[PDB]
Amino acid sequence: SMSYSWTGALVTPCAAEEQKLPINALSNSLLRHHNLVYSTTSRSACQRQKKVTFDRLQVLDSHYHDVLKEVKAAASKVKANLLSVEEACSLTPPHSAKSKFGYGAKDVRCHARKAVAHINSVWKDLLEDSVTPIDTTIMAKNEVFCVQPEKGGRKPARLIVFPDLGVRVCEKMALYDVVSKLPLAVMGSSYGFQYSPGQRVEFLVQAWKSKKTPMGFSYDTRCFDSTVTESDIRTEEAIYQCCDLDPQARVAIKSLTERLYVGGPLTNSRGENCGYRRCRASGVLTTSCGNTLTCYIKARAACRAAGLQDCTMLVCGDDLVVICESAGVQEDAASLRAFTEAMTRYSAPPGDPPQPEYDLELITSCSSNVSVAHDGAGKRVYYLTRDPTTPLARAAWETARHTPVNSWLGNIIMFAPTLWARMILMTHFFSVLIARDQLEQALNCEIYGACYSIEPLDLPPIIQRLHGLSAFSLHSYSPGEINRVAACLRKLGVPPLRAWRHRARSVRARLLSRGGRAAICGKYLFNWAVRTKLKLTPIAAAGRLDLSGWFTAGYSGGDIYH
């Protein structure tokens, strides 16, 4: 059972693709080593195709089946509703790929007659045809990274596989409620997407502290999407059907599973047949939910096979962290090898073998880690951070070129308490917005895969709500974090933190002079940059912000607008 078969046709672009960071005075002011920053393009698609193509052998055992039974029992407590066409239309992002059948994202969002008529015809066809594979488009993702020569140079492009816009709207009708409720119901505190960054830190810190002698590890499955088998995807369907569902939804979910999720033909942007998929599609509504459920089932079963004592797991799609009670150094190393053997039998072998970790700050969940800073009183504060390299490279790219969705705003929100988000990202982007007369304009960004429209001037109350007032006053960061940031600035050619402090003082002054929300940005976001501190008190506006649903479920690849 090969994850893919190929015809030899190329994955083609639908537009020109810039490969290197363009030179632009504003982006250059953030980072000057532009030759290190690149975007993946269709040019490397063949390299990715080779990597993700392999035979999957799967041997399921009693632990696997015990866990699946638990999961189906928990799922039976869930009730999920159908969305109306109108409700589903409104979940469509303004930048969503146009339909091959004569309408676009804008038409769907306005509930245009041509779009709605087609969507209805697709739904009708899901009800009437349970078997014929649905076409998908394969594209090479353009994502920005910094080169790491000591690791292999450049990453090849990820491949995205997605059905037509009409099908995507139907997926929401049938499954939006399911994928929004089911993972939480099934795995409880282990479902990572239910947590804000602060809540994730609280979860990890308590898991660590509760152990006599904690040991943790991350498990990196190699090409997780390709390891997901046809039986895995059919098992996901059986799990969805455990919910209380509307009769039409039950038929549509089965049709979507057999005709789309389980596999199907891959077409390039030129309309040529590229091959056939028999694994997870990365661009469907169920990608995040399915990966999370399947990773959880396999991992929980593998924890049992591995004899891991008192296992606490946090799962976000294909991303897995486990914290447990240590049985000794040799014992732990052996247990982790047995965990890997079990995951492998379940079809999911690792890229690099996992390693036992005994220091909390080294535990990595979704490319992030817990670190320690201090508040005003010498009190230790735990917060979530990450290596700033990819955030900084992407920020530079997004300064030089307009992109429909901006990673920098999401990063500022997620990583507000960090040394680097505060001193570099906030300073840079307020300076850019001021320079371009764009301070008052809402921007699209992504949180857990879902797209949101956010006004930068609302950052202070948003940050207060999510991270608390201390996020504006943390100091005395860890030696490890300070060193990691410093190495990153040297690598990328980013000005030193003391330079950013000077720039921040100027930006702060300009913001204060504007009054209103801008003055609140100057006051709260940049208090770190002045020697004469202002007293930061709860922002009146913070209480009224909704923030409902921001950190509730994962939708990466799901084409979701909130």
End-to-end C-alpha distance for the chain, whole angstroms: 38
List residues forming the annotated binding site for Mg(2+). 220, 318-319
Task: Give dist(CA 370, CA 380) in Å, integer.
Answer: 12
Pairing of strands 450-454, 443-447: antiparallel
Rg, the chain, Cα only: 24
Q: Which of 22, 2, 63 is nearest to 343 (CA)?
A: 63
Task: Give dist(CA 326, CA 217) in Å, integer.
Answer: 12
Check the CA dihedral 25-28-33-37 and report its sign.
Answer: negative
Task: Give dist(CA 200, CA 204) in Å, integer.
Answer: 6
Task: Give dist(CA 120, CA 170) in Å, integer.
Answer: 8
Residue 382, both tokens: 């735990």
Between the alpha carbon of residue 333 and those of residues 321, 341, 354, 361, the distances in Å are 16, 13, 9, 19
Q: What is the DSSP letter of 245?
A: -
Residue 368, both tokens: 């992030």
Collapsing DSSP states into helix, strand and coil, what is residue 500? helix
Helix axes 479-492, 389-400, angle to 10 degrees: 40
| Identity of the residue numbered 46 | C
Pairing of strands 273-277, 380-386: unpaired
Collapsing DSSP states into helix, strand and coil, what is residue 8? coil
In 10 A of CB 232, how many CB atoms? 24
φ/ψ of residue 326, rounded to 5: -65, 140
Q: Which of 273, 253, 272 is nearest to 264 (CA)?
A: 273
Helices (H), 241-286: 247-256
Contact between 201 and 370 (Cβ < 8 Å)? yes
Residue 179 CA to chain centroid, in angstroms? 15
Between the alpha carbon of residue 437 and those of residues 121, 402, 432, 456, 458, the distances in Å are 45, 15, 8, 13, 17
Is residue 559 packed enough to be buried (19+ CB in 10 Å), middle (13-18) or exposed (0-12)?
Answer: buried
Collapsing DSSP states into helix, strand and coil, what is residue 54? coil
List residues forming the annotated binding site. 220, 318-319
Task: Give dist(CA 365, CA 351) in Å, integer.
Answer: 16
488 half-sphere exposure, CB direction, 13 A CA radius: 21
Is residue 73 packed enough to be buried (19+ CB in 10 Å), middle (13-18) or exposed (0-12)?
Answer: exposed
Task: Give dist(CA 40, CA 318) in Å, integer.
Answer: 21
